[PDB]
């Protein structure tokens, strides 16, 4: 076939190009980082009534002041996960303190590359890219509440909003409008919970949504279905305006 | 219109259906349900606007679109000539079926011209055209009191609504009116010619030993103008259409009339089919008229 | 039996009638001259063949004039020259009516044309297509190219020469075959009115050697009597791409059928008249001559943008359909991955049936879901 490491003829990775589309795949995941904190909302996506969205989690909490949405394939992430929140335990465990978002954040993406056969300059023992991308939000004193992209290509930016999975684009267009640094936690929950019902195929419910917040107190802070329910029937009336 | 009654029957009920009133309205449920689109516009000009009005009646033929004539009506008037008439009947047009149509119409029944006169004249046979006796009230049968006048553009479309008229509500006075017009045999002027084309429509399928012997009267006699062609034909086909019953009529008729050759000739060669509503699916189509060809 | 017999009865008559008819007016006309006219006319003609016993041609005989016969045999019978030295005659060498060379070429013109060709062009063009805005539904950027390459210097050459420039002289085209990608091609050829050749590489392999050589010859030929003409190959992996298989040895011609195509239409042949297209599944597989610019210079897939262009797509698609306008294209659009201005079809075509089991005029969101799925379930490919 072709190797895995193989650079398009424009010098880009197969694999991770191909992998970015899984992510488009990922439910959409969408969150803002505010001054006040960073809303977190996720498509549940439950594939039948019997599902039950509970045991559904794209939304994950790396730790109190950093955690962290998926949106790709989910349980490649666990690995990730586990591996995130070791490495603030693991920072902690030496620095005894928290760990700069970033510096987790970076960290983590450094997994990225690491699926190769027997590759060249290293041993990475993995077969292919990572098929899920993350929404990552954490508080930390340097940089107060930040929100960072991850990406099976390694990179990630810093973030005032921003939009993955399915309907990213459009709801990321929705974003570039919306968005402004003066935005509070309730509204980004509104604007989150909204541009969601947006580009959420299904009718938004805090069943076949989820939400979450990382506040600089608090640090990450779920939010359960019936203050989301409160909310959505929130933005109801306020979508219903005019 | 029938009775009650379980055999004649003919209810107040079917009045709605079997003559068509509501179910058209009702249609415009389904046509509504899957539709075409507005074309019509006001456009620039008078030679712009000559159809644009027919438009109303062309797309709202059948329906009530009429506020844009009714609302505007020099857009009907601002056509002029037979499109004048035209504008004029296409209300007609839009008001076909109609307990009473004649209110655009006799409006423009007359305002100046004969052509204006005309519109209604033509669009008023249009009201009931389809039925004899409109949908409710009297309005193609007031029309006959329009029609008459032995003059270029009133004759001409009252001939056409009197035509539309008188199919199923067929009369003898159109005749011995058009006859008479008919034996003046004038087309820019009495319009006869085509009168008797239009008295071919007013008897359809039936025998009339008037008309067999009217333009046996008239064409025979060659009556006032005759030279052309068209005297010849106009009362030609005239015969055609009102008889064209029988059973030996279907091949009989053409026996004796395509046979020859003449105005009233080549023509009347397929109205043998148009003739006789017992027997349909006839070849005689291309059985017979392969020959004229060759 | 008796009544249904009655309308027998009138069939008989009925027929009698024009039989009856049909004689009488067949006694008025009494047909020679059509012919016997321009017979004894284009008999003058088939005379004037007819002394010295005489647009492809193929072979003129006009023979047997010994003074003087004036005339090409290109056949196994006494094979002609006209010419060494001035040699000619005043209209037309000689006779066959046939006069002229066959096609092979001696000496100019000389009677003006006999010629050209056998197997017309066995490859046949279809000028003006059918298509002109019909599949161009949702393929802008490429078509923003081919008109590029294609419409504009078809328009007004002038640019390029006022740049001092011609248009890309040869283009790739590639994705699903054909599928709206030949008739996109047709379409900016309907659209400029060019002349569109559909040359498939399946016509260019065949039974004999040099064969599509000659063709594209042929090709090449009326291409330039064509000219302002689309030269369009879908299948350019027909003929196959670069390859070793001449390793092998039986290939060659094959091979050099390309490099027949390959050769001549690199020097003389003007594309900016002349177009060149060239369609495909895999530009991976190029013989790189072909890549080569002025002969390939602009390269271009079919494709398959986004959600976006797919509604469009679907929107222009479905207008056919009786849809539900409630419903959104966007709706659906959103489902479906990305996939081909044929396959967006299935998402409206589909649900015509959908819209005939649901029985709907317009096809509910479902009834495209269910396709979306359906369809794209039933790939497994």
Redesign the interface.
């Given at each position: 076939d072709r190797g895995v490491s193989t650079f398009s003829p424009e010098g880009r990775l197969f694999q991770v190009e191909y992998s970015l589309?899984a992510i488009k795949?990922g439910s959409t995941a969408i969150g803002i980082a505010t001054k006040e904190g960073v809303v977190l909302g996720v498509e549940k996506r439950a594939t039948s009534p019997l599902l039950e969205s509970d045991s559904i989690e794209k939304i994950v909490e790396i730790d109190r002041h950093i955690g962290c949405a998926m949106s790709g394939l989910t349980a490649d992430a666990r690995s990730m996960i586990e591996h995130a929140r070791t490495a603030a335990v693991t920072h902690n465990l030496y620095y005894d303190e928290d760990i700069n978002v970033e510096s987790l954040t970076q960290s983590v993406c450094d997994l990225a590359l690491r699926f190769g056969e027997g590759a060249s300059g290293e041993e990475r023992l993995m077969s292919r890219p990572f098929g899920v991308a993350l929404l990552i939000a954490g508080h930390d004193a340097d940089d107060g509440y930040q929100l960072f992209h991850a990406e099976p290509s390694g990179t990630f930016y810093r973030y005032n909003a921003k939009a993955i999975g399915?309907?990213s684009?459009?709801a990321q267009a929705e974003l570039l409008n919306e968005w402004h640094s003066s935005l509070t936690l309730k509204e980004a929950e509104l604007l989150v919970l909204k541009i969601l019902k947006q580009?959420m195929?299904e009718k938004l419910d805090e069943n076949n949504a989820q939400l979450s917040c990382i506040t600089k107190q608090d640090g990450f802070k779920i939010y359960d279905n019936e203050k989301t329910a409160e909310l959505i029937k929130e933005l109801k009336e306020k979508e219903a305006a005019e | 219109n029938g009775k009650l009654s379980e055999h004649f029957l003919y209810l107040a009920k079917e009045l709605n259906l079997t003559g068509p009133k509501v179910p058209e309205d009702i249609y415009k449920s389904h046509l509504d349900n899957s539709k075409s689109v507005f074309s019509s516009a006001g456009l620039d000009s008078a030679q712009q606007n000559l159809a644009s009005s027919f438009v109303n009646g062309f797309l709202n033929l059948g329906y009530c679109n009429d506020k844009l004539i009714v609302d505007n009506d020099n857009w009907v008037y601002k056509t002029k000539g037979d499109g004048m008439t035209s504008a004029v009947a296409s209300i007609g047009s839009i008001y076909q079926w109609n307990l009473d149509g004649l209110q655009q119409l006799d409006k423009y029944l007359y305002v100046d011209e004969p052509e204006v006169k005309a519109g209604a004249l033509l669009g008023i046979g249009i009201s009931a055209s389809g039925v004899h006796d409109g949908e409710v009230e009297p309005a193609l049968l007031l029309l006959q009191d329009y029609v008459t006048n032995p003059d270029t553009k009133i004759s001409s479309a009252a001939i056409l609504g009197l035509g539309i008229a008188f199919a199923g509500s067929k009369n003898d006075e159109v005749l011995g009116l058009l006859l008479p017009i008919a034996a003046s045999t004038d087309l820019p002027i009495e319009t006869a010619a085509m009168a008797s084309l239009a008295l071919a429509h007013v008897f359809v399928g039936t025998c009339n030993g008037d008309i067999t012997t009217s333009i046996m009267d008239n064409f025979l006699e060659r009556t006032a103008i005759e030279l052309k062609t068209d005297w010849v034909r106009f009362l030609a086909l005239a015969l055609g259409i009102l008889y064209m019953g029988q059973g030996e009529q279907v091949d009989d008729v053409l026996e004796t009339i395509s046979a020859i050759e003449h105005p009233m000739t080549s023509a009347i060669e397929v109205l043998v089919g148009s003739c006789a509503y017992t027997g349909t699916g006839d070849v005689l189509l291309i059985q017979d008229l392969l020959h004229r060809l060759t | 039996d008796d009544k249904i017999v009655p309308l027998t009865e009138g069939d008989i008559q009925v027929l009698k009638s024009y039989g009856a008819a049909p004689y009488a007016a067949k006694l008025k006309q009494t047909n020679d001259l059509k012919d016997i006219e321009a017979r004894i006319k284009e008999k003058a003609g088939v005379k004037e063949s007819d002394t010295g016993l005489a647009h492809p041609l193929q072979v003129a005989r006009c023979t047997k004039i010994i003074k003087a016969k004036y005339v090409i045999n290109l056949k196994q019978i006494a094979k002609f020259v006209v010419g060494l030295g001035e040699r000619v005659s005043p209209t037309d060498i000689e006779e066959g009516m046939r006069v002229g060379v066959d096609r092979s070429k001696y000496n100019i013109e000389l009677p003006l044309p006999p010629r050209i060709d056998p197997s017309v062009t066995m490859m046949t063009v279809e000028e003006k297509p059918d298509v002109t805005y019909s599949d161009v539904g949702g393929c802008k950027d490429q078509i923003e190219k081919l008109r590029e390459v294609v419409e504009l210097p078809l328009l007004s050459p002038e640019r390029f020469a006022t740049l001092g420039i011609d248009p890309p002289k040869g283009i790739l085209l590639y994705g699903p075959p054909g599928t709206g990608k030949t008739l996109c091609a047709r379409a900016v050829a309907n659209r400029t009115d060019a002349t569109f050749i559909r040359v498939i590489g399946s016509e260019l392999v065949q039974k004999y050697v040099g064969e599509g050589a000659r063709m594209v010859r042929e090709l090449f030929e009326m291409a330039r009597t064509k000219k302002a003409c689309i030269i369009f190959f879908d299948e350019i992996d027909a003929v196959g791409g670069a390859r070793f298989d001449d390793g092998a040895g039986g290939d060659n011609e094959v091979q050099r059928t390309m490099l027949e195509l390959i050769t001549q239409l690199d020097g003389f042949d003007p594309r900016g008249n002349i177009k060149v297209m060239f369609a495909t599944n895999r530009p991976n597989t190029l013989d790189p001559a072909l890549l080569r610019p002025g002969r390939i210079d602009r390269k271009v897939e079919f494709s398959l943008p986004?959600?976006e262009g797919r509604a469009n797509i679907f929107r222009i698609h479905s207008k056919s359909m009786s849809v539900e306008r409630g419903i959104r294209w966007e709706?659906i659009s959103?489902?479906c991955?990305n996939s081909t201005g044929a396959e967006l079809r299935s998402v409206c075509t589909e649900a015509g049936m959908f819209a005939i089991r649901a029985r709907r005029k317009v096809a509910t969101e479902k009834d495209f879901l269910k396709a979306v799925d359906k369809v794209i379930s039933g790939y497994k490919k």
């Amino acid at each position: 076939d072709r190797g895995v490491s193989t650079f398009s003829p424009e010098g880009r990775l197969f694999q991770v190009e191909y992998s970015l589309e899984a992510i488009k795949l990922g439910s959409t995941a969408i969150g803002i980082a505010t001054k006040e904190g960073v809303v977190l909302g996720v498509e549940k996506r439950a594939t039948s009534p019997l599902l039950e969205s509970d045991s559904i989690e794209k939304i994950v909490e790396i730790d109190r002041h950093i955690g962290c949405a998926m949106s790709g394939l989910t349980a490649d992430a666990r690995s990730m996960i586990e591996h995130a929140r070791t490495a603030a335990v693991t920072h902690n465990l030496y620095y005894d303190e928290d760990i700069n978002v970033e510096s987790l954040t970076q960290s983590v993406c450094d997994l990225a590359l690491r699926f190769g056969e027997g590759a060249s300059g290293e041993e990475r023992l993995m077969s292919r890219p990572f098929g899920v991308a993350l929404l990552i939000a954490g508080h930390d004193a340097d940089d107060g509440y930040q929100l960072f992209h991850a990406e099976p290509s390694g990179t990630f930016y810093r973030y005032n909003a921003k939009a993955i999975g399915s309907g990213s684009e459009g709801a990321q267009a929705e974003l570039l409008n919306e968005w402004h640094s003066s935005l509070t936690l309730k509204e980004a929950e509104l604007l989150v919970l909204k541009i969601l019902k947006q580009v959420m195929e299904e009718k938004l419910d805090e069943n076949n949504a989820q939400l979450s917040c990382i506040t600089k107190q608090d640090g990450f802070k779920i939010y359960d279905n019936e203050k989301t329910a409160e909310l959505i029937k929130e933005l109801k009336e306020k979508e219903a305006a005019e | 219109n029938g009775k009650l009654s379980e055999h004649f029957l003919y209810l107040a009920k079917e009045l709605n259906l079997t003559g068509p009133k509501v179910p058209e309205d009702i249609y415009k449920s389904h046509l509504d349900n899957s539709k075409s689109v507005f074309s019509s516009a006001g456009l620039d000009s008078a030679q712009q606007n000559l159809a644009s009005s027919f438009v109303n009646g062309f797309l709202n033929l059948g329906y009530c679109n009429d506020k844009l004539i009714v609302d505007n009506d020099n857009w009907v008037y601002k056509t002029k000539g037979d499109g004048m008439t035209s504008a004029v009947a296409s209300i007609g047009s839009i008001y076909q079926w109609n307990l009473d149509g004649l209110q655009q119409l006799d409006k423009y029944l007359y305002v100046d011209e004969p052509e204006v006169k005309a519109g209604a004249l033509l669009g008023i046979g249009i009201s009931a055209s389809g039925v004899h006796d409109g949908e409710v009230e009297p309005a193609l049968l007031l029309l006959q009191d329009y029609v008459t006048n032995p003059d270029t553009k009133i004759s001409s479309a009252a001939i056409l609504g009197l035509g539309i008229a008188f199919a199923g509500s067929k009369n003898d006075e159109v005749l011995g009116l058009l006859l008479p017009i008919a034996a003046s045999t004038d087309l820019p002027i009495e319009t006869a010619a085509m009168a008797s084309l239009a008295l071919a429509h007013v008897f359809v399928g039936t025998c009339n030993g008037d008309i067999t012997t009217s333009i046996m009267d008239n064409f025979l006699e060659r009556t006032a103008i005759e030279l052309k062609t068209d005297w010849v034909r106009f009362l030609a086909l005239a015969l055609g259409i009102l008889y064209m019953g029988q059973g030996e009529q279907v091949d009989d008729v053409l026996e004796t009339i395509s046979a020859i050759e003449h105005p009233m000739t080549s023509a009347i060669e397929v109205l043998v089919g148009s003739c006789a509503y017992t027997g349909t699916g006839d070849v005689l189509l291309i059985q017979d008229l392969l020959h004229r060809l060759t | 039996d008796d009544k249904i017999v009655p309308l027998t009865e009138g069939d008989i008559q009925v027929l009698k009638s024009y039989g009856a008819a049909p004689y009488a007016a067949k006694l008025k006309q009494t047909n020679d001259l059509k012919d016997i006219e321009a017979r004894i006319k284009e008999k003058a003609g088939v005379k004037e063949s007819d002394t010295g016993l005489a647009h492809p041609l193929q072979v003129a005989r006009c023979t047997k004039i010994i003074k003087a016969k004036y005339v090409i045999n290109l056949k196994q019978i006494a094979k002609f020259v006209v010419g060494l030295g001035e040699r000619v005659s005043p209209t037309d060498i000689e006779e066959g009516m046939r006069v002229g060379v066959d096609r092979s070429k001696y000496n100019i013109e000389l009677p003006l044309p006999p010629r050209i060709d056998p197997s017309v062009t066995m490859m046949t063009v279809e000028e003006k297509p059918d298509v002109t805005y019909s599949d161009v539904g949702g393929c802008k950027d490429q078509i923003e190219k081919l008109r590029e390459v294609v419409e504009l210097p078809l328009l007004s050459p002038e640019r390029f020469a006022t740049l001092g420039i011609d248009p890309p002289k040869g283009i790739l085209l590639y994705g699903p075959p054909g599928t709206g990608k030949t008739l996109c091609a047709r379409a900016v050829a309907n659209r400029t009115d060019a002349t569109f050749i559909r040359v498939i590489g399946s016509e260019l392999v065949q039974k004999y050697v040099g064969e599509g050589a000659r063709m594209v010859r042929e090709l090449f030929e009326m291409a330039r009597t064509k000219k302002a003409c689309i030269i369009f190959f879908d299948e350019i992996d027909a003929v196959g791409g670069a390859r070793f298989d001449d390793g092998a040895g039986g290939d060659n011609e094959v091979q050099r059928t390309m490099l027949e195509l390959i050769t001549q239409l690199d020097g003389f042949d003007p594309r900016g008249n002349i177009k060149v297209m060239f369609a495909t599944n895999r530009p991976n597989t190029l013989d790189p001559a072909l890549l080569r610019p002025g002969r390939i210079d602009r390269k271009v897939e079919f494709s398959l943008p986004d959600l976006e262009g797919r509604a469009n797509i679907f929107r222009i698609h479905s207008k056919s359909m009786s849809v539900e306008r409630g419903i959104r294209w966007e709706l659906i659009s959103r489902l479906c991955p990305n996939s081909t201005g044929a396959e967006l079809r299935s998402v409206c075509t589909e649900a015509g049936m959908f819209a005939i089991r649901a029985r709907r005029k317009v096809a509910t969101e479902k009834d495209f879901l269910k396709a979306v799925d359906k369809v794209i379930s039933g790939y497994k490919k």
